Amino acid sequence: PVSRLGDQSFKEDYGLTYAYLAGAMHRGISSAEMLIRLGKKGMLGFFGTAGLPIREIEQALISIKKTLKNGQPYGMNLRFEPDHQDREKELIDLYIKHEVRVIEASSYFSVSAPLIYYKAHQLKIDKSGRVIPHNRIIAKVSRPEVAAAFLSPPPQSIVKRMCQHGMLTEEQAEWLSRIPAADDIIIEADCGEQSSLTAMLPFFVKLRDEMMETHKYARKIRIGAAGGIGTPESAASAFLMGADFIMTGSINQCTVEAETSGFVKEMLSGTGICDTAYAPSETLFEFGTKVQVLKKGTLFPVRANKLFQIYQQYESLSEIDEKTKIQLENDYFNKTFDEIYESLIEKQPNLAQKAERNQKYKMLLLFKWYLQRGCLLALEGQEEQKVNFQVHCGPSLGAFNHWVKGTDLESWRNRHVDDIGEKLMNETESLLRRRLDTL
Amino acid sequence: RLGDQSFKEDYGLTYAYLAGAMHRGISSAEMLIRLGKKGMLGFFGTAGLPIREIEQALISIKKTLKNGQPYGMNLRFEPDHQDREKELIDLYIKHEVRVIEASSYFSVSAPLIYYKAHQLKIDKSGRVIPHNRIIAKVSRPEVAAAFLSPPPQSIVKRMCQHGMLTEEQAEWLSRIPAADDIIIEADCTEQSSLTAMLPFFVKLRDEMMETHKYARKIRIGAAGGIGTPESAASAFLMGADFIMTGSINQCTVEAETSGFVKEMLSGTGICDTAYAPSETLFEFGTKVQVLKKGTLFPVRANKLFQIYQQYESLSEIDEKTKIQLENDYFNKTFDEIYESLIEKQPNLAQKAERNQKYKMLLLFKWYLQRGCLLALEGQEEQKVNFQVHCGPSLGAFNHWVKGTDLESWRNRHVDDIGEKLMNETESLLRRRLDTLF
Ligand SMILES: Cc1cc2nc3c(=O)[nH]c(=O)nc-3n(C[C@H](O)[C@H](O)[C@H](O)COP(=O)(O)O)c2cc1C
Ligand SMILES: Cc1cc2nc3c(=O)[nH]c(=O)nc-3n(C[C@H](O)[C@H](O)[C@H](O)COP(=O)(O)O)c2cc1C
């Protein structure tokens, strides 16, 4: 029960017993059951909203609220998508409707009006003249300028715009300028971008300290650490560099709680440190955005990377040589270009106006569907098409597996998300105490 | 004071701090000299240099370091050219080099076994005492396993049949590991994470220790990402017996690289590096971390790899893109640059007319070589094509030294930056015991 790792103030404000968060996994892989189990142990999970329709997100919220009815910690992810700010306002209104008091903001480059509106809800000032937030944000960042934005107060450009539209009140807009754009930050390194936490984490920790003496807020902003945390040594290293809390993703996919196919959870059980690869990202494909995926038992990383090299080498979709055109339609997708396009015009016929106009966009959405298809096939059951499975994963799982090798935890069916976190947290504190003295 | 006590004694160090090699002599003789006087171990950058420049550097270091001061030599592995390896080990034995940094090896080789065998002996107590030592630089489990395990008896038995080893040296070599020590290298040419890798290799060393039961313990080093007191503190906390630093050392008075590059390097940040294709194993998608701030080299080098996988022939490149390579990337035509590579070897030009892929492969490999040479040169304004190897560690170091007099590369001395790094790492570990608890 000791749990002396991380910042004491962070645990109080979020209602935790351990300064341990479990990051989101898309399409509900970070399930309602996952959060429920973390909430009962005083740990903070984030529901995987990305990809899901509002129907499934709304259902997951009420499901959690009726089990977690004693102030237990739970949160929701909110992934930034550029042209879909219509859904951002909907999700924040839904989060305010279902009393979600913490969100994980990811893929943001700047703070937005819906994020400002979220923090503003039930915002108030105490008798002492200090701004007390009701709803909190933990921005997951990988770059200095983004971290800087979220550590700095919200842009007046947006706060003033919001008052003209009645979304904020002058009392709220003044209180928002006296607090950071996000309540806390997470530094992401090798998530399932590709920079090391060892070179990054000391910088962001100093940047937080710089922003603290500059803006002079009431309470401290806490810096989290994510990407590569799968063992007591990994977490101990993060905490030693100055992390106020830790965060894990890759491990949590290999548990009873996570919503992914059982074969995938079994493939995940036997992965090693060198069984991952950098594939192109679905959301920001054309810009060379990478995604770390599973390599053991799947051709998806090679096949996905091959689709990117052809997008850059050819401008039109029809300019692909006959020799290579046939292999994509037969074994990658298992469907021709025209029948794939016929299904994609069915949903959103609007985009077809752009596909007819621009031959690059026509090509782009076809290859983006291979990445979607791969993710969906991994989530499905009773399917022996493991060659196209896209399973987001990092070396941290491989490191975790190696650490648990020999114990009863080798099988995923004995891995409970709360007990793996509890063990990780307790061995980390045991190692720190030990290693520091054994100098 | 920090690290493994036995490692410092066997290599004659005051600090368990090594400085990795930097190709084409960038890890200069002067650097090794300055590190040797502070009780730190530097490895001379032999890669790319001809034997005359390596031989000259050796005698230069011996003329200055004769008080048993620590210095070593790098040795990379090239399968196409084994004679270069043989000659270098004979040169290292000629000039009394007692420690070597083995890189890009997948298996221990006859020249490495011959190196450890020189002046090898057994004490009165019946324990094998090595004269010449190897520190293998590995990034993979199977390679680390090989070097932790004793030398393959088949290479050792074949070496006896050719008179390279004796009957008693061959027995002594089987009772000791293939390399005296290991360095786990991550991120720096690989995509590996020191946080996920280091705990494994430390356990693998322990497994190999109880298995083979050698006399003396094998020490595990840590390289890739160490540019600050908390990076090193993290490595030492994960079980590193010593740490190694490369990117930071390139930005010091002692390193042999152009002053403009040292100025470029002084202002780099954590996000100012990029993964470009490697000179060696280019076709296989092997990556190399390079400088991004001020150079177009990472983009231009990566574009050449896309062109190689796209087409089959060098002449099949469309006219629009064919012209920009011959004028912006380099200042020679495809036929003209082929003439530049006549001097090195005519027999490889035979294979080029035979295979049209090999023809374009060696052309794109020269862009990478040209980029490296242009960075080393002075009076340079060809910054656009400079290939400067670097990692986020330099950016992290710069941010740590921001505000102090060490901000300029002229105020930075390789021994004092290492001394400070190690002094503050010690301080950080000791003080955080009281801080977090
Ligand atoms: C299956 C999977 C799905 C993920 N999906 C998302 C996502 O939708 N949103 C997000 O913010 N992070 C996502 N992540 C990243 C994690 O939340 C976490 O920050 C990261 O994996 C930490 O790195 P680690 O895996 O090395 O511990 C995902 C990770 C995995 C393994
Ligand atoms: C300029 C430069 C050149 C390098 N050349 C070599 C080389 O020839 N051989 C080698 O084994 N390592 C080489 N390295 C790797 C370093 O010796 C070292 O392993 C590593 O860079 C340490 O990590 P750091 O870059 O994060 O400080 C090079 C690194 C740099 C910065």
From TrEMBL, chain A:
Top-tier EC class: transferase
UniProt catalytic activity: holo-[ACP] + malonyl-CoA = malonyl-[ACP] + CoA
Binding locations of FMN 2: A24, H26, S106, K140, E188, G227, G228, G249, S250, S396
Transferase is among the record's keywords: yes
Superkingdom, natural source: Bacteria
Molecular function GO labels: [acyl-carrier-protein] S-malonyltransferase activity; nucleotide binding
BP term (GO), one: fatty acid biosynthetic process
Binding-site positions, FMN 1: A24, H26, N77, S106, K140, G192, G228, G249, S250, S396
Keyword Nucleotide-binding found: yes
The family this protein is said to belong to: Belongs to the FabD family.
Name of the protein: [acyl-carrier-protein] S-malonyltransferase
Gene symbol of the encoding locus: fabD
Residues of the full protein shown: 324 to 765 of 768
